[PDB]
Amino acid sequence: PKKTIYFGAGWFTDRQNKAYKEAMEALKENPTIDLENSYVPLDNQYKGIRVDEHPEYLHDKVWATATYNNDLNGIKTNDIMLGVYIPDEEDVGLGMELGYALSQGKYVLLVIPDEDYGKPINLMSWGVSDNVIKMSQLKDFNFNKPRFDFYEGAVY
Amino acid sequence: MPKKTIYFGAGWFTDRQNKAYKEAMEALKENPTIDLENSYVPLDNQYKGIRVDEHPEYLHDKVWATATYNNDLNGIKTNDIMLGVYIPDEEDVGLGMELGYALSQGKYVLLVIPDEDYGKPINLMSWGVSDNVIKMSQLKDFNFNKPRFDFYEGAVY
Amino acid sequence: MPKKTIYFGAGWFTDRQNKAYKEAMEALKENPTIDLENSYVPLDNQYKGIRVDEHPEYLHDKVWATATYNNDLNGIKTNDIMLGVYIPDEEDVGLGMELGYALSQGKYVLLVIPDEDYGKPINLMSWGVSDNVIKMSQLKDFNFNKPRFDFYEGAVY
Amino acid sequence: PKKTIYFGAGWFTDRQNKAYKEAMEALKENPTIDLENSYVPLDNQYKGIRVDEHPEYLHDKVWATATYNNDLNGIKTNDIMLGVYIPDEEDVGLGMELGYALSQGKYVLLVIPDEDYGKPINLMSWGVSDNVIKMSQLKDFNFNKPRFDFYEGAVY
Amino acid sequence: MPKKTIYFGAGWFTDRQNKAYKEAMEALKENPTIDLENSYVPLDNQYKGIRVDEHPEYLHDKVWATATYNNDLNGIKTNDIMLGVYIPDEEDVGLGMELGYALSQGKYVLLVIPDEDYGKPINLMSWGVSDNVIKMSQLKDFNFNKPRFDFYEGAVY
Amino acid sequence: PKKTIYFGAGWFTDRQNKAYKEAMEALKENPTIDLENSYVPLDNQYKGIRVDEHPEYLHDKVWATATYNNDLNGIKTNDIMLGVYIPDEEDVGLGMELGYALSQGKYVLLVIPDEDYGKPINLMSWGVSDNVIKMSQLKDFNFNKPRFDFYEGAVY
Numbered sequence: 042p043k044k045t046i047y048f049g050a051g052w053f054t055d056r057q058n059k060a061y062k063e064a065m066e067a068l069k070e071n072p073t074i075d076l077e078n079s080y081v082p083l084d085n086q087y088k089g090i091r092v093d094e095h096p097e098y099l100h101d102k103v104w105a106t107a108t109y110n111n112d113l114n115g116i117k118t119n120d121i122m123l124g125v126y127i128p129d130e131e132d133v134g135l136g137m138e139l140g141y142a143l144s145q146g147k148y149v150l151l152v153i154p155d156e157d158y159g160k161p162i163n164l165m166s167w168g169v170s171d172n173v174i175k176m177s178q179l180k181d182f183n184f185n186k187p188r189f190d191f192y193e194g195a196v197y
Numbered sequence: 198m199p200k201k202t203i204y205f206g207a208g209w210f211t212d213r214q215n216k217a218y219k220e221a222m223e224a225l226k227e228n229p230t231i232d233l234e235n236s237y238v239p240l241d242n243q244y245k246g247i248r249v250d251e252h253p254e255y256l257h258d259k260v261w262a263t264a265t266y267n268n269d270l271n272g273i274k275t276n277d278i279m280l281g282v283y284i285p286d287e288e289d290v291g292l293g294m295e296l297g298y299a300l301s302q303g304k305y306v307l308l309v310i311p312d313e314d315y316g317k318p319i320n321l322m323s324w325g326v327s328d329n330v331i332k333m334s335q336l337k338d339f340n341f342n343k344p345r346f347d348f349y350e351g352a353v354y
Numbered sequence: 355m356p357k358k359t360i361y362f363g364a365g366w367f368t369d370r371q372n373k374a375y376k377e378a379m380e381a382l383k384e385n386p387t388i389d390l391e392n393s394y395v396p397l398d399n400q401y402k403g404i405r406v407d408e409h410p411e412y413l414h415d416k417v418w419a420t421a422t423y424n425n426d427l428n429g430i431k432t433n434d435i436m437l438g439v440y441i442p443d444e445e446d447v448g449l450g451m452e453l454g455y456a457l458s459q460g461k462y463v464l465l466v467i468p469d470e471d472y473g474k475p476i477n478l479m480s481w482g483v484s485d486n487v488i489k490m491s492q493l494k495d496f497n498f499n500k501p502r503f504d505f506y507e508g509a510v511y
Numbered sequence: 512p513k514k515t516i517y518f519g520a521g522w523f524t525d526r527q528n529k530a531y532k533e534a535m536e537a538l539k540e541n542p543t544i545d546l547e548n549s550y551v552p553l554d555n556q557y558k559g560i561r562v563d564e565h566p567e568y569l570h571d572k573v574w575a576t577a578t579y580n581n582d583l584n585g586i587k588t589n590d591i592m593l594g595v596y597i598p599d600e601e602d603v604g605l606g607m608e609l610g611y612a613l614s615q616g617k618y619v620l621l622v623i624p625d626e627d628y629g630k631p632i633n634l635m636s637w638g639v640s641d642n643v644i645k646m647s648q649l650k651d652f653n654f655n656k657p658r659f660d661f662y663e664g665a666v667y
Numbered sequence: 668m669p670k671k672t673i674y675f676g677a678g679w680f681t682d683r684q685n686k687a688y689k690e691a692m693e694a695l696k697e698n699p700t701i702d703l704e705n706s707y708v709p710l711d712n713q714y715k716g717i718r719v720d721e722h723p724e725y726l727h728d729k730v731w732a733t734a735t736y737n738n739d740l741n742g743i744k745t746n747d748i749m750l751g752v753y754i755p756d757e758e759d760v761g762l763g764m765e766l767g768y769a770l771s772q773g774k775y776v777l778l779v780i781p782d783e784d785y786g787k788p789i790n791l792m793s794w795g796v797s798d799n800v801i802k803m804s805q806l807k808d809f810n811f812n813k814p815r816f817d818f819y820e821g822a823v824y
Numbered sequence: 825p826k827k828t829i830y831f832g833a834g835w836f837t838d839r840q841n842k843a844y845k846e847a848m849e850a851l852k853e854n855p856t857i858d859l860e861n862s863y864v865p866l867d868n869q870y871k872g873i874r875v876d877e878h879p880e881y882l883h884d885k886v887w888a889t890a891t892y893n894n895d896l897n898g899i900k901t902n903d904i905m906l907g908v909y910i911p912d913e914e915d916v917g918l919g920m921e922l923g924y925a926l927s928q929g930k931y932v933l934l935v936i937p938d939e940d941y942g943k944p945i946n947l948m949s950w951g952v953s954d955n956v957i958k959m960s961q962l963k964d965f966n967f968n969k970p971r972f973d974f975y976e977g978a979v980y
Contacts, residue, residue: 078656105324112322134320137294137322141300148900164265197249271816345425348421454607458614460772479603479604483607736951759919770927792921822883
């Protein structure tokens with residue numbers, strides 16, 4: 042039995058992009074996940090338009106509405122909310138997604154790189170989370186039996 | 198005559214944040230549609246009146262975190278409007294979450310950006326949860342009895 | 355003394371609808387439990403004040419649709435009661451949706467049927483979302499501070 | 512992997528009944544759907560009583576409560592909300608179901624007959640929808656990867 | 668000046684329950700933050716004014732059950748605070764459900780325990796749904812305009 | 825196709841413990857249920873601590889928070905809410921869980937021992953329920969096609 046996820050992860054910095062690649066490698070190796078039918082944002086850009094190459098779309102409200110809608114739709118139609126979370130580079134966008142996931146009754150799992158696990162995270166991030174784990178535990182996490190636990194680290 | 202209460206969503210972690218905080222609070226004091234005395238201000242409602250900047254021993258205390266987290270949620274759900282003091286270059290993951298929770302509890306979500314920054318690009322998901330976004334100089338006068346959807350007059354990254 | 359605000363759910367697409375609209379609005383003006391000045395009337399809150407009956411160029415405009423749709427939702431969620439002016443022979447898919455959304459946001463859903471039609475069969479799902487349904491002549495006097503569940507005195511098809 | 516649906520469709524008119532038969536034929540041929548475990552209203556009439564043959568049940572409040580409850584239960588316990596939507600014969604009942612589906616966090620898909628696709632639909636119908644498609648696209652729609660898109664047609 | 672309305676969650680099935688009921692109602696009469704006249708009291712809002720203790724013929728009536736059940740839900744969702752008069756040795760499955768429903772509709776959930784019993788262990792899930800729990804002698808004076816999360820000063824079994 | 829459940833059942837009395845064992849035997853024999861990936865509270869005690877043997881944990885707020893959270897998490901991440909319901913020993917805890925299940929859009933099924941089916945149940949328990957059945961019908965209940973029905977018994 043496999044569960045699908047929403048791949049909540051930033052792609053703006055070096056530490057973010059590192060964590061992204063690690064978490065995606067982890068999922069490819071996790072037998073409880075259906076990655077092919079999961080919602081990965083970067084593979085679901087509206088009408089395939091790459092906003093790096095056409096920044097004129099940052100002032101287009103239809104572009105924004107669809108992208109925003111598609112990402113929410115990604116969360117609500119999948120089983121688990123995954124949040125790749127960097128403590129020194131905390132993301133207001135991911136913050137919002139975690140709130141939305143809560144409201145749609147999803148398990149919220151945060152994944153922190155092991156080099157950073159233990160470091161202080163925002164109180165509300167701590168709170169929305171059902172659990173938070175090290176990146177090394179993601180390859181083996183049992184998504185069929187997901188459970189509540191506390192972060193073993195600081196919170197501000 | 199009719200007054201609404203708010204939840205004062207705002208960071209206090211940087212200089213620009215602290216500045217925005219002071220400005221927005223002065224704004225509300227002067228707004229005749231707001232009951233500020235019965236509004237929820239987080240910093241006045243941390244568990245046992247203690248903040249972890251001033252008492253770092255509480256960084257690892259799970260009782261303090263549980264109650265503070267719960268009280269902040271309780272603040273959002275029992276007040277009429279969700280207010281988010283928002284700095285575009287210093288966006289807060291905490292406030293991000295609060296905006297989502299406010300959405301789920303059916304509150305008007307209003308962002309307030311300092312005038313010096315209004316127009317600057319904001320995160321897509323912040324744009325989206327928002328019902329409306331205004332300059333800090335509009336906050337003294339905003340009519341909270343007739344709150345409306347509008348699009349931000351600025352970019353989104 | 356205590357007053358509630360409403361969302362004025364009503365079609366404007368037919369003659370009977372437009373008649374019902376005018377009657378219900380006069381009713382609310384005279385109801386002492388309602389604050390009509392701070393209530394949400396859709397027709398006064400379309401995006402950019404423009405309606406697509408009067409400006410058909412907006413039929414294919416997605417910005418206009420997004421904002422109007424959002425503002426109507428915002429109208430429901432930030433007011434106390436969901437009011438649905440309901441014609442049984444001219445039932446509105448738009449109002450149908452609004453009734454569902456109001457349910458999800460925990461509002462009292464009140465239907466008002468013109469007296470000439472009260473008793474006529476209404477759609478099952480409209481019956482079901484409703485907390486209560488009344489004749490137009492009851493609307494001037496309805497006590498919105500003590501709203502109650504009751505069954506429609508009529509059929510359902 | 513198969514998803515289940517709620518078959519939201521009127522049966523009161525000729526155009527409605529045509530659309531019904533087409534959409535059901537479409538689903539029978541769609542490999543991403545489990546139709547056997549989907550909720551089809553007309554196959555789930557309370558205590559098998561046919562209201563055509565016994566209209567005395569239209570004044571029975573217990574009959575109405577159960578039917579109304581069963582239909583909502585149909586929406587909440589299935590994966591996708593399907594709405595067969597005729598633009599010239601818009602249904603207040605379907606309208607309500609779409610709102611309920613939104614509130615229960617389901618993908619809302621509308622299906623319009625191709626002869627009608629493009630014609631004006633109500634604004635709120637447009638809004639609740641995650642996507643709207645032509646009847647001919649239903650046989651092949653991928654329900655494992657459902658996405659946000661705008662109707663390519665008018666709205667009042 | 669600002670007043671909130673409540674839903675009077677309380678059993679009436681035992682002597683201790685009936686005692687607690689009378690005490691809590693006297694408390695609210697004297698609380699200046701409450702509008703009791705516009706609050707929802709279940710016992711005054713059963714379908715057709717009839718209670719099944721006094722008319723056991725209604726034990727098997729599904730119309731009576733549907734409307735009463737609906738009206739009780741409607742009571743919770745259209746009032747500001749969820750109040751639960753709670754006896755630890757006589758815990759009520761009905762009130763248990765109401766507390767959950769109140770949570771889902773985003774209401775402050777306040778439990779009131781008789782002073783003679785405050786401190787006694789309460790069910791885990793009751794503890795958890797609750798925002799706060801107080802002694803009956805605190806109820807006359809509780810400020811419902813500034814309701815806060817707090818932990819019960821007692822055990823949980 | 826199998827659905828998972830949350831095993832809502834008391835363990836404090838003789839009648840409760842009897843009903844528990846019967847309902848669990850029933851599920852083991854039901855082909856529509858995945859019991860291995862269901863949430864059974866007693867197998868999910870926080871950090872394996874047995875509160876019978878260490879009652880000092882009844883005054884620990886972290887223990888309570890995690891247990892309470894894990895049980896809610898159990899309800900929200902499974903498909904069906906099962907409530908083993910004894911009419912003479914009605915549980916305020918189960919009451920709350922049923923409300924939560926409703927709010928998360930789950931089918932709520934109550935199971936009453938046959939020796940008790942028919943006996944009066946609380947109005948609000950009746951109301952939250954989508955259906956209520958005899959313990960003997962649980963071995964064969966079709967959880968892929970769950971439907972609305974009324975309790976055939978009294979309510980106070």
